[PDB]
Design a protein around this ligand. Structure first.
Ligand SMILES: [Ca+2]
Ligand SMILES: [Ca+2]
Ligand SMILES: [Ca+2]
Ligand SMILES: [Ca+2]
Lengths: 59, 50
């Protein structure tokens, strides 16, 4: 894949793990709203990661 | 959703958590949220270029 693609992959992975850290810290505080947003973020970062991999070097 | 649009979603949502975390003095969460936003910016820039 191209440099752009490798950056999207690397960034997507970092966000996924960071969102997971917020999910833990938010629920530790019983901050349900913040947790739900972090969940949505994790879902989007995961989707970017899987979609980018699925199309790796294709274009 | 395109990768570009999913990065846009994260960019904004990350700053919304930043704002709500600040309101709760959840500083560790706020810092992570801001870092998430910066990384989303890179996906957005890369997806824009591509
Ligand atoms: Ca709880
Ligand atoms: Ca493919
Ligand atoms: Ca391929
Ligand atoms: Ca930004």
């Amino acid at each position: 894949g191209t440099k752009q693609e490798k950056t999207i992959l690397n960034m997507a992975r970092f966000i996924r793990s960071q969102a997971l850290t917020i999910l833990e810290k938010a629920n530790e505080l019983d901050a349900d709203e913040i947790a739900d947003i972090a969940e949505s973020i994790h879902d989007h970062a995961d989707e970017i990661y899987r979609s980018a991999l699925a199309r790796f070097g294709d274009d």
